Design a protein around this ligand. Structure first.
Ligand SMILES: *[C@@H]1O[C@H](CO)[C@@H](O[C@@H]2O[C@H](CO)[C@@H](O[C@@H]3O[C@H](CO[C@H]4O[C@H](CO)[C@@H](O)[C@H](O)[C@@H]4O)[C@@H](O)[C@H](O[C@H]4O[C@H](CO)[C@@H](O)[C@H](O)[C@@H]4O)[C@@H]3O)[C@H](O)[C@H]2NC(C)=O)[C@H](O)[C@H]1NC(C)=O
Ligand SMILES: *[C@@H]1O[C@H](CO)[C@@H](O[C@@H]2O[C@H](CO)[C@@H](O)[C@H](O)[C@H]2NC(C)=O)[C@H](O)[C@H]1NC(C)=O
Ligand SMILES: *[C@@H]1O[C@H](CO)[C@@H](O)[C@H](O)[C@H]1NC(C)=O
Ligand SMILES: [Ca+2]
Ligand SMILES: [Ca+2]
Ligand SMILES: [Ca+2]
Ligand SMILES: [Ca+2]
Ligand SMILES: [Ca+2]
Ligand SMILES: [Ca+2]
Ligand SMILES: [Cl-]
Ligand SMILES: [Mg+2]
Lengths: 214, 454, 466, 216
């Protein structure tokens, strides 16, 4: 099959910029390539076919170019609506194959996360379970690492992470990390911590509490 | 009656190009009339015949004409794990031309096509193709509705149904007033013949170079058939349009099928969904009834009448003998919903092998008496066999049975003078509609200007 | 008493004869003033008119050549006679008429040419197998009818050009059957194979080496082949003095004039021979199929009898074409041509079962009428053709010529010929409208108004310029 | 106007089979190829196969040979994708696609059909309040929703009242069951001053529990 290596996997840019997404095929495909757009939580719309041809209805700020095995989608003067996912697809050969995709993201000034830890609820505990939750809210950029420590030692098992899409108001990201232990196991220890590693600081932002103590 | 046969105007193309094989009047966006001329054997780039088209400005002195350029290069596209191929050698570009609004359509009925897939193929066949141009803007498009990407084995496994490989789309052509291009494709569906229709606007907007196989969604094609009466009928050898169902919002199609029903021949009138409204049957086998059709109201009642040419009709003569001379049939359209009947008038040629009825051109109203008139060609007619065109005037009861005027070919033997004809347009703006006559055997076109009645 | 001869009050011997074929003229000097010199011959002698001064031509017909009908068409280099008499002299005076006879014989043991022209598209493969012995078998049956048989062979498929011909892949050009599991010949239009010969095993052996080809559309190019077999006389080998049978076998519809445009061919067929030393029809890809009218013209010109031997599925088609090409015969061919011998024998019988007179170069002012005697001395008026004849039969026609007035040219000849026959009757006509005494007239005669006039045939005529 | 309208989300068990539909709107399904494409968050986009509805001829990626069967009924202007012997990995969104002009292109897309293959029974969520631990000017509470199936759930604060400054994170699959959580932020003076409640509705089991956040 023909492999489609699409780059970059994501980019942070701003309204008005001129940006270019590239696509490289594992062999010549003579312009038999399409470009697609997927808006957050919606279906796909076709942008380009056969290398350079606008799909009916697509604004001309979109343009396609390239030949042989290398192609590019270019968007002149980004509009608010243009922040979404983009994919290339080759149809020189069956099976049709797709690029890995590219996500356009809103650029903004860096911002450290607001960390919050929450011990197991009484209800849960009385049911036999124990979940320690940790929120990391409104940070930028998106790249972040969370580490859980029980009594000072790192813990990896039983961790469940969830991320939101860039926020519509402030253009920041948030994350949720949950550590789940059995009630019994949760009581074998005292100290619970989650460390947030972000580029906005060389020191991990730390938050923790001690069971029983309060 | 009043065409001037003394001061003609001559246009000429390259030797051997068959300049004049087809022609039409063309009006630019300003209403300026020019003449578009097909020359289906004009040499291409590889010193090989591909055909070509010429756009002749009007000048009393005639002369040479600039080319209307179209892409003459063979194309290849590897896509979908297949190899698509066009072959333009001997395609006969300009074997038909027609003008509508400020657009020109020139067809290459013998353009070949093939699709390769590993060791298999569609088969290299003459699907035909049409080229479109808007001269003033330089816009170009193409339309080739019989191109397909099915492999040979699939047709065999499916008993050769819906087989459009030998269409020769563009063999004949016409455009409705609303701008729908209608193509005759006599080879369609394994030589039954088919029609293909699509709005000119959609042809332009859906076309891009290099694609080769693309969808024109508003297009509409006619249908295959299991009825042997249709086999090898060349339905679409000729085509025309007119109003024949009394409802002015529908356009009806007229289709010649000269070898219909074991070469009896036929002409059919259809609605725009290809549903048959009437069928006229040929009178004599092999006469090629349906070779040409014309639509015009000749008796001034506002209802379109139909003329049909059968250029090989053999007339009965003394001593149980038959003489091939050709014949034209006029059918007057009756008031309201009713069948066209027997012919209202039979016109029969006189010169042996003359092919009277090989072309029939509406003239509009030549002598300005309130009735529309026609010209009929006999390309090998006349006392010298060089070719004649005969003018017949309309009248309250149909047409006059005797020609009001006869134009003898000004060209040498073999010119095929009259093989193509077009009338009903006033090219010199003198208030009388004029006649252009193609003589492809001589690579020339003659213009006859109508003058005040003497 | 007075008649139209006298009552008409003529002015000259010439005007007299023109009154009625019964009128006569007296050029005698000694004739009473009141006595008319234009009257019945009986009345002139009755009035003492010198017998030598009587002008009275009589329409007559005398035979000049009257060879007897042959009993056998064998032997000779065609000193055979099948029409009698062969030449006669016919004299007619104004408005008169005369009758004569013609005998026509369908002679026994007349030579025969049979050229077998065969569809070799793929569905005729089995047919090719079953006629490998036809040459000798046909010789056996025809021997009963003629002792001078020649036969020959030619074959056709269709114009070797797209879309009739498969043109891809390249292998398909060299072997059209490639995508099947066999080999067949590259496509050919028409090829001549065996010139007419009396050596019948040459036919068997040529046929055994023939093979089929393959093409795309059902109608075939046989009409191209009929035309060439017809107009390439020398190559096909037709003989001057023989029945010509052209046997056309196919199981399919046929292409016709104006079909060629589907292959980009618009040049009308020129009716000329285009088969050269390679024995293939070289204008196949550049010239349209021939029209029925053109075929008719050439067939008639070369005296070829065309036989459509076709399968049940297209017999009606060819019967209908046959009605548009008079003289053509149709027979039903089985799906493998296994019955083609009897078909040919029956066709030959039907061909020589008719006599049909034809007139050529008949002067405008002459009209003819015919009474036919066919079968058994049964006269059939207003008929000039006999049917249901057998080889050896003889028929005859009574003919009457009627001249209107008197034409400017006093001598014309015309021909009466049976359709398809070599021999004919030449009628040499002489219009006797003048008087012998005119050749000795007297211009500016002392007797005529002091030289103002001319004295001829015993009367004064106004001279030239008056 | 060209629209491809696909059937609704499916919810099936492993080993079973399901048949999706794609109905042409504003056009004849017989006009072009119709393709099917599979999308997953990790694996991305994958071409399954195509069908020419005019004649029923299909092509497939060999990977999907066996599981995928593509069909079409020109009568109901519809095309189908049947999946068999379903598995967890068959969990994804499926799109039907057709070209605009180019015979071979991929220009028009249906809205997509979500497929979820699970053994999980319809289970109601456990809602746990998240009060901070025993200072600043801003305060943050939370709500944990654990062990429910299938999706989705609606989560609000004070019945949609408190809206601004709220984060509800995308559910995540935990051992055949889903877990989701939401955070909210206000000023110290607001809480525990003002009662804040967590409203969670799970229509599937038709349950609308609401936990009020209480300090420790
Ligand atoms: C070879 O040539 C023959 C002879 O021309 C063709 O045979 C004729 O074919 C036509 C068309 O099918 C037939 O026309 C029909 O005539 C019918 C009445 O004819 C009767 O009487 C004749 C007397 O000779 C009989 O032979 C015949 O059997 C009938 O008993 C009409 O009833 C038909 O009318 C219907 O169809 C016409 C359209 O064609 C409509 O206009 C009418 O409204 C109606 O629907 C019809 O007109 C004709 O009968 C045939 N004649 C003979 C002698 O058979 C062959 O077709 C032709 N073959 C080939 C392959 O070329
Ligand atoms: C052909 O036969 C007709 C009779 O059917 C002949 O006509 C008759 O000829 C005789 C001759 O004495 C006349 O007396 C009759 O009056 C004629 N009858 C008619 C006019 O029907 C005729 O002579 C024959 N013609 C030829 C050329 O032999
Ligand atoms: C003409 O007819 C007569 C009978 O009326 C016949 O006796 C005579 O022989 C015929 N003339 C010729 C020359 O055949
Ligand atoms: Ca209408
Ligand atoms: Ca009318
Ligand atoms: Ca008029
Ligand atoms: Ca004019
Ligand atoms: Ca056979
Ligand atoms: Ca053929
Ligand atoms: Cl064949
Ligand atoms: Mg055949």
């Amino acid at each position: 099959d023909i492999l489609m290596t699409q780059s970059p996997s994501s980019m942070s840019v701003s309204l008005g910029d001129t940006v270019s997404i590239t696509c490289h095929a594992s062999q010549g495909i003579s312009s038999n390539i399409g470009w697609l757009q997927q808006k957050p939580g919606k279906s796909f719309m076709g942008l380009i076919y056969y290398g350079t041809n606008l799909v009916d209805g697509v604004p001309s700020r979109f343009s396609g170019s390239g030949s042989g095995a290398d192609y590019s989608l270019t968007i002149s003067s980004l509009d608010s609506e243009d922040f979404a996912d983009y994919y290339c697809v080759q149809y020189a050969q069956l099976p049709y194959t797709f690029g890995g995709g590219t996500k356009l993201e809103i650029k903004r000034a860096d911002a450290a996360p607001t960390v919050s830890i929450f011990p197991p609820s009484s209800e849960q505990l009385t049911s036999g379970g124990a979940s320690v939750v940790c929120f990391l809210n409104n940070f930028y950029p998106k790249d972040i690492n969370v580490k859980w420590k029980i009594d000072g030692s790192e813990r990896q098992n039983g961790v469940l992470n969830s991320w939101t899409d860039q926020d519509s108001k402030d253009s920041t990201y948030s994350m949720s990390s949950t550590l789940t232990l059995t009630k019994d196991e949760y009581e074998r220890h005292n100290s619970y911590t989650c460390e947030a590693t972000h580029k906005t600081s060389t020191s991990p932002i730390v938050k923790s509490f001690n069971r029983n103590e309060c | 009656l009043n065409l001037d046969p003394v001061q003609l105007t001559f246009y000429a193309g390259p030797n051997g190009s068959q300049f004049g094989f087809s022609l039409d009047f063309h009006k630019d966006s300003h209403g300026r009339v020019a003449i578009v001329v097909g020359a289906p054997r004009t040499l291409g780039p590889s010193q090989e015949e591909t055909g070509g088209v010429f756009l002749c400005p009007w000048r009393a002195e005639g002369g040479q004409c600039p080319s209307l350029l179209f892409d003459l290069r063979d194309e290849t596209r590897n896509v979908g794990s297949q190899t698509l191929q066009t072959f333009k050698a001997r395609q006969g570009l300009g074997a038909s031309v027609v003008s509508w609004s400020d657009v020109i359509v020139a067809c290459a009925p013998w353009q070949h096509w093939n699709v390769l897939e590993k060791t298999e193929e569609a088969e290299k066949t003459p699907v035909g193709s049409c080229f479109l141009a808007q001269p003033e803007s330089g816009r170009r498009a193409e339309y080739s509705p019989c191109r397909g990407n099915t492999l040979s084995r699939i047709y065999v496994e499916n008993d050769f149904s819906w087989d459009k490989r030998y269409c020769e789309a563009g063999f004949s052509s016409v455009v409705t007033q609303a701008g729908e291009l209608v193509l005759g494709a006599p080879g369609g569906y394994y030589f039954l013949g088919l029609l293909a229709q699509a709005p000119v606007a959609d042809i332009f907007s859906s076309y891009r170079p290099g694609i080769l196989l693309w969808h024109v969604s508003s297009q509409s094609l006619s249908f295959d058939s299991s009825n042997p009466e249709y086999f090898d009928g060349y339905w679409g050898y000729s085509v025309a349009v007119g109003e024949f169902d009394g409802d002015l919002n529908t356009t009806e199609y007229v289709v010649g099928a000269p070898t219909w029903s074991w070469t009896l021949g036929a002409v059919e009138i259809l609605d725009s969904y290809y549903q048959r409204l009437h069928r006229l049957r040929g009178e004599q086998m092999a006469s090629y009834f349906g070779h040409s059709v014309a639509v015009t109201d000749v008796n001034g009642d506002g209802r379109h009448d139909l003329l049909v040419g059968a250029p090989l009709y053999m007339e009965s003569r003394a001593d149980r003998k038959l003489a091939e001379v050709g014949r034209v049939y006029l059918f007057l359209q009756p008031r309201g919903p009713h069948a066209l009947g027997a012919p209202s008038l039979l016109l029969t040629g006189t010169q042996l092998y003359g092919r009277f009825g090989s072309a029939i051109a509406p003239l509009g109203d030549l002598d300005r008496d309130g009735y529309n008139d026609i010209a009929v060609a006999a390309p090998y007619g006349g006392p010298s066999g060089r070719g004649q065109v005969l003018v017949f005037l309309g009248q309250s009861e149909g047409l006059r049975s005797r020609p009001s005027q006869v134009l003898d070919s000004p060209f040498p033997t073999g010119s095929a003078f009259g093989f193509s004809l077009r009338g009903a347009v006033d090219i010199d703006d003198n208030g009388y509609p004029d006649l252009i006559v193609g003589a492809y055997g001589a690579n020339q076109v003659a213009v006859y200007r109508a003058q005040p009645v003497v | 008493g007075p008649n139209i001869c006298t009552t008409r009050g003529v002015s000259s011997c010439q005007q007299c004869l023109a009154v009625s074929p019964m009128c006569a003229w007296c050029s005698d000097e000694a004739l009473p003033l009141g006595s008319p010199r234009c009257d019945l011959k009986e009345n002139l002698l009755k009035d003492n008119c010198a017998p030598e001064s009587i002008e009275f031509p009589v329409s007559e017909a005398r035979v000049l050549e009257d060879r007897p009908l042959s009993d056998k068409g064998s032997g000779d280099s065609s000193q055979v006679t099948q029409v009698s008499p062969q030449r006669i002299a016919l004299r007619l005076r104004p408005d008169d008429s005369k009758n004569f006879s013609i005998q026509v014989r369908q002679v026994e043991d007349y030579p025969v040419d049979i050229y077998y022209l065969m569809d070799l598209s793929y569905s005729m493969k089995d047919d090719l197998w079953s006629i490998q012995n036809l040459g000798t078998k046909l010789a056996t049956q025809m021997r009963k009818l003629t002792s001078n048989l020649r036969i020959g062979f030619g074959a056709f498929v269709d114009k070797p050009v797209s879309p009739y011909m498969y043109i891809s892949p390249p292998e398909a050009l060299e072997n059209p059957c490639y995508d099947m599991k066999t080999t067949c010949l590259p496509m050919f239009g028409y090829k001549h194979v065996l010139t007419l010969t009396d050596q019948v095993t040459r036919f068997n052996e040529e046929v055994k080496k023939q093979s089929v080809s393959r093409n795309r559309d059902a109608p075939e190019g046989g009409f191209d082949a009929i035309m060439q077999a017809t107009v390439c006389d020398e190559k096909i080998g037709w003989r001057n003095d023989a029945s010509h049978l052209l046997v056309f076998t196919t199981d399919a519809k046929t292409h016709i004039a104006l079909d060629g445009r589907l292959a980009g061919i618009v040049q009308p067929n020129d009716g000329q021979c285009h088969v050269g030393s390679d024995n293939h029809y070289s204008a196949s890809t550049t010239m349209d199929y021939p029209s029925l009218g053109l075929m008719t013209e050439k067939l008639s010109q070369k005296n070829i009898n065309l036989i459509f031997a076709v399968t049940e599925n297209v017999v009606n088609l060819y019967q209908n074409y046959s009605e548009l090409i008079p003289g053509t015969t149709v027979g039903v061919l089985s799906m493998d041509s296994s019955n083609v011998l009897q078909l040919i024998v029956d066709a030959y019988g039907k061909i020589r079962s008719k006599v049909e007179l034809e007139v050529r170069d008949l002067p405008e002012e002459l009209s003819l009428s015919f009474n036919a005697t066919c079968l058994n001395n049964e006269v059939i008026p207003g008929l000039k053709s006999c049917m249901g004849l057998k080889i050896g039969d003889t028929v005859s026609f009574s003919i009457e010529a009627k001249v209107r007035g008197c034409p400017q040219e006093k001598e014309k000849s015309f021909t009466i010929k049976p359709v398809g026959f070599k021999d004919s009757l030449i009628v040499q006509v002489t219009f006797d409208c003048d008087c012998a005494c005119q050749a000795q007239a007297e211009p500016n005669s002392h007797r005529c108004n002091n030289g103002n006039g001319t004295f001829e045939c015993g009367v004064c005529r106004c001279g030239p310029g008056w | 106007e060209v629209q491809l309208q696909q059937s609704g989300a499916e919810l099936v068990k492993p080993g079973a089979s399901v048949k999706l539909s794609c109905t042409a709107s504003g056009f004849n399904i017989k006009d072009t190829y119709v393709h099917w494409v599979k999308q997953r968050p990790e694996q991305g986009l994958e071409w399954i196969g195509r069908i020419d509805p005019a004649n029923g001829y299909t092509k497939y990626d060999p990977k999907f040979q066996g599981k995928a069967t593509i069909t079409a009924d020109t009568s109901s202007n519809t095309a189908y994708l049947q999946l068999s012997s379903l598995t967890s990995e068959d969990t994804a969104v499926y799109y039907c696609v057709r070209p605009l002009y180019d015979y071979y292109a991929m220009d028009y897309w249906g809205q997509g059909t979500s497929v979820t293959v699970s053994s999980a029974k319809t289970t109601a969520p456990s809602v746990y309040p998240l009060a901070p631990v025993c200072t600043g000017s801003s305060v943050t509470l939370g709500c944990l929703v654990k062990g429910y199936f299938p999706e989705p759930v609606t989560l609000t604060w004070n019945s949609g009242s408190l809206s601004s400054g709220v984060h509800t994170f995308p559910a995540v699959l935990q051992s055949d069951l889903y877990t989701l959580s939401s955070s909210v932020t206000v000023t110290s003076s607001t809480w525990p001053s003002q009662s804040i409640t967590c409203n969670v509705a799970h229509p599937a089991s038709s349950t609308k529990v609401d936990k009020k956040i209480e300090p420790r």
